[PDB]
């Protein structure tokens, strides 16, 4: 309950760099239909927003500035909006990948033409001759890794949102 | 500097969560011959001991009766040993994945029972005309993703070990 007003800024900075690095890392070509997480280009601007929010509070510890508090609460409102948007998109993406493909979400050419003949949503043996094949096993491993990455991202986003809710007051 | 070492306890806690979560993520059966980082189970114990040290690091930040001075040397030495072991493991694994492996490091059975037929070390069919198959593209994508993960982990481990070395000095 309102422990410290400064030590959380470094945490927010590191989570912002976390989102930026994850967004940069998850740009590898995977299927014609890229995941909705990267098509929107959400992680990069989200992470830059978190890094700016952290830089605005981690190393200031000051008051008696009207502009400072105005910008702080406005950017906190945008941070809440970004957090809820990220939660919604993560839930939609995990439900789309896990359950069944229902959205196209075409992406840019430089991340789509690299792998234009592969699928990462429903890759099951159409014929029994490839029930246990390297292609389907590799796609299953890719899907499992993507599910794990999405779960980790959702957990970290939930923790960060809880931290913000505890720091909004 | 030593003046503001209190704020880094949560940083070390987050680093421990990093080690534990990434160990759990890499625990998945990505090929028969798993990277040496996950076979030795270094990330799990490294993260747990970072968690313990960070919990003790931000206990009181002062001189109690007997609460901090006893650990401030032993746990710092353990953290330094963990950091050097981790960077050694990372620089060994990057070479073992970039160059043909000379360690076996067989994966454990209870995870190998899921996907026991994935080969990354030599995924090149003898047919030169077979290079256009999607299997080769999948193997190349897996190799690129693993290279990116190893590079990011090495960079972040170097950053955390250098900041810890600077703080303890």
């Amino acid at each position, epitope marked *: 309950f309102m422990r410290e007003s400064k030590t959380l800024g470094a945490v927010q900075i590191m989570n912002g760099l976390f989102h930026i690095a994850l967004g940069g890392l998850l740009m590898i070509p995977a299927g014609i239909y890229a995941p909705i997480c990267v098509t929107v280009w959400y992680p990069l601007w989200g992470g830059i927003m978190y890094i700016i929010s952290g830089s605005l509070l981690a190393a200031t510890e000051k008051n008696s500035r009207k502009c400072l508090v105005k910008g702080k609460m406005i950017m906190n409102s945008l941070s809440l909006f970004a957090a809820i948007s990220g939660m919604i998109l993560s839930i939609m993406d995990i439900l789309n990948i896990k359950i069944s493909h229902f959205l196209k979400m075409e992406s840019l050419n430089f991340i789509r033409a690299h792998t234009p003949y592969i699928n990462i949503y429903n890759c099951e043996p159409a*014929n029994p001759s490839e029930k246990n094949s390297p292609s389907t096993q590799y796609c299953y491993s890719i899907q499992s890794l993507f599910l794990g990455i999405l779960s980790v991202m959702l957990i970290f986003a939930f923790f960060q949102e809880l931290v913000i809710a505890g720091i909004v007051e | 500097f030593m003046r503001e070492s209190k704020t880094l306890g949560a940083v070390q806690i987050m680093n421990g969560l990093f080690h534990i979560a990434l160990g759990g993520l890499l625990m998945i059966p990505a090929g028969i011959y798993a990277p040496i980082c996950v076979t030795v189970w270094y990330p799990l114990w490294g993260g747990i001991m970072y968690i313990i040290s960070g919990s003790l690091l931000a206990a009181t930040e002062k001189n109690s009766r007997k609460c901090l001075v006893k650990g401030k040397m032993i746990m710092n030495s353990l953290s330094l040993f963990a950091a050097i072991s981790g960077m050694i493991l990372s620089i060994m694994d990057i070479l073992n994945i970039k160059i043909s492996h000379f360690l076996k490091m067989e994966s454990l059975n209870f995870i190998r029972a899921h996907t026991p037929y994935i080969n990354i070390y030599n995924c090149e069919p003898a047919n030169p005309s077979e290079k256009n*198959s999607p299997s080769t593209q999948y193997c190349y994508s897996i190799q690129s993703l693993f290279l990116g993960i190893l590079s990011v982990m090495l960079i972040f481990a170097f950053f955390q070990e250098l900041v810890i070395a600077g703080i303890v000095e």
Partner: antibody, heavy 116, light 110 residues
Framework: VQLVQSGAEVKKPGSSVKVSCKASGYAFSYSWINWVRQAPGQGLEWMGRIFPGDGDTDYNGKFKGRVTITADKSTSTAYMELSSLRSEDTAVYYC????????????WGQGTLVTV | DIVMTQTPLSLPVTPGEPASISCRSSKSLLHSNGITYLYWYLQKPGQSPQLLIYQMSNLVSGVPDRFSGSGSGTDFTLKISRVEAEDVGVYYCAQNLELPYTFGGGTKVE
């Protein structure tokens, strides 16, 4: 890669016959073994398939499960085991190696004919 | 299961002009993936069987150059620009999408 199969054998109705389809020059556990029989009067007819890596097996289901197929990893050779052969079952059997990702049954075998 | 019918059954050999092998599937073979699987076999005495055409889009190396093949999804036709006496034999049409596998009756060409 080379495929060596045993010579033709002459049998009698109601007996049992075994054929050795030796495999060499490739990864025996990285290919699904397919067996196809050819009888006079009509074309080819699939009968069964086996995967020696995990022991998974498939059957045509045309008959009441009379097909019994097993594989040995130590020798990398699959064996034929059929009970109570009949006159109508007199045909030549071929063991073929499959290639994944498009080349379904490009590789064939020498084949072995059985007469009862 | 799945039964295939082909015609003509005999198709006497005549070099150059006449060359047409037709096969059809009774289950309207289509997996909605944009492609349809089809295979062709040649059985001439003297050697073991070999693959000729795979899903009617490309051919294995070493095949005679004057070979082709296409289809629509329900009726499949095989066309040869110039048939020769060297590559004489029977034609087998095959489908592999569900168990059990069934092979065509073949067209005995003499």
């Amino acid at each position: 890669v080379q495929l060596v199969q045993s010579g033709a054998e002459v049998k009698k109705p109601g007996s049992s016959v075994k054929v050795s389809c030796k495999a060499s020059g490739y990864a025996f556990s990285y290919s699904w073994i397919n067996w196809v029989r050819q009888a006079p009067g009509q074309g080819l007819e699939w009968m069964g398939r086996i995967f020696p890596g995990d022991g998974d097996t498939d059957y045509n289901g045309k008959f009441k499960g009379r097909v019994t197929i097993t594989a040995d990893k130590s020798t990398s050779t699959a064996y034929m085991e059929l009970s109570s052969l009949r006159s109508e079952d007199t045909a030549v059997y071929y063991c073929a190696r499959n290639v994944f990702d498009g080349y379904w049954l490009v590789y064939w075998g020498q084949g072995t004919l059985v007469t009862v | 299961d799945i039964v295939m019918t082909q015609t003509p059954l005999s198709l006497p050999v005549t070099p150059g002009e006449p060359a047409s092998i037709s096969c059809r599937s009774s289950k309207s073979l289509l997996h909605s993936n944009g492609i349809t699987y089809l295979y062709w076999y040649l059985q001439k005495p003297g050697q073991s069987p070999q693959l000729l055409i795979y899903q009617m889009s490309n051919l294995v190396s070493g095949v005679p150059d004057r070979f082709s093949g296409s289809g629509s999804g329900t009726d499949f036709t095989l066309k040869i620009s110039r048939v020769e006496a060297e590559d004489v034999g029977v034609y087998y049409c095959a489908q592999n999408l569900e168990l059990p596998y069934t092979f065509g009756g073949g067209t005995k060409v003499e």
